[PDB]
Structure formats: structure tokens, C-alpha cells
């Protein structure tokens, strides 16, 4: 059973695909978001993404369809590699740590309108060992996913 805070966080994530704020992800919004993140999605690959999550035949994913997607069961092994896959999406320069610049790169692709101060406070709060970057452990930790690391 998800708290309001966990639903809210999913919703804020939903909001980054739904740029026109219609309350749905269309196929063209999905395509723009996947390219930006560096996956090279194909027109037909997008049709399958859309069809598999939209359960009411609208051709769009609303927050409730997205919310099933983002709360479906997953084993611990699958979930670890999930966090890991996401950490490596950031690590662009393959250095083993998430730097200010990684984050700035990723916030921009998702269309976050963040200042450097706001990015630095995001770096600052995860850091922990005071090195100015975010390693694997402290990544797991700020995601509130400690027992997986």
C-alpha cells in the first residue's frame, strides 16, 4: 500500500513525460523522452510500449496506467539491476560516480528547469563521504533502497 508521498513522487515522474500536462503520455511524448535519454527507439518499438501499458484503448497512458507500470512486482535481483542500470545512465563518463555534471545532463534531458544551486544541493545531500560526487552506495541510499546494495 503506497503512501501519498510515494504516489506523489511517481506523479512528478509521470509529469516529465507528459510535457503538455494533458494528464496522458502520447506516442510522440514517449518518443521525445526516450531519444533525450539516449535510447534510440524505433517507430514500431514505441507502438508496443504504448499498447502494453494503455489498458483502456485510448492510445495514451494516464497516471493510473503509468502507476500500475511503476508498481508492478519485481524480485530483488531484478530490482538491484534496475537501480544499477539507472546509475549507469547517469555515469556518462564511466567514472563510477555521479557528478554535478552527470546530474545536470540528466535533469536537462528530462526537461527539468533546475538552477545550478538546486543541482548542487541535490549533489550535496546525497554525498555523505564529502567527496563532491555520488558513488553507488550513496545512490542506493538516497533512493531509500539500502537493503539492496
Amino acid at each position: 500500500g503506497l503512501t501519498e508521498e510515494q504516489k506523489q513522487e511517481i506523479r512528478e515522474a509521470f509529469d516529465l513525460f507528459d510535457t503538455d500536462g494533458s494528464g496522458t503520455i502520447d506516442a510522440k511524448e514517449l518518443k521525445v523522452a526516450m531519444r533525450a535519454l539516449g535510447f534510440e527507439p524505433k517507430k514500431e518499438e514505441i507502438k508496443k510500449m504504448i499498447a502494453d501499458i494503455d489498458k483502456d484503448g485510448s492510445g495514451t497512458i494516464d497516471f493510473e496506467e503509468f502507476l500500475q507500470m511503476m508498481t508492478a512486482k519485481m524480485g530483488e535481483r531484478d530490482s538491484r539491476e534496475e537501480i544499477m542500470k539507472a546509475f549507469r545512465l547517469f555515469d556518462d563518463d564511466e567514472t563510477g560516480k555521479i557528478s554535478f555534471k552527470n546530474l545536470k545532463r540528466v535533469a536537462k534531458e528530462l526537461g527539468e528547469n533546475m538552477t545550478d544551486e538546486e543541482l548542487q544541493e541535490m549533489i550535496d545531500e546525497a554525498d555523505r563521504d564529502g567527496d563532491g560526487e555520488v558513488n553507488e552506495e550513496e545512490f542506493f541510499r538516497i533512493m531509500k533502497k539500502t537493503s539492496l546494495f
Partner: peptide
């Protein structure tokens, strides 16, 4: 806090959609 997790959930979603395609 929420910013970190928000990014996580968006990038996790990207990763799920990619998984669906293949």
C-alpha cells in the same frame, strides 16, 4: 529527497519501456 527519487522513477520508467520493446 523527492528530486532524487523523481529522477529515479522517470529513468526507471524509460528502462521499463525499453524492456517492453525488446
Amino acid at each position: 529527497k523527492r528530486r532524487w527519487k523523481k529522477n529515479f522513477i522517470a529513468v526507471s520508467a524509460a528502462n521499463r519501456f525499453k524492456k517492453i520493446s525488446s
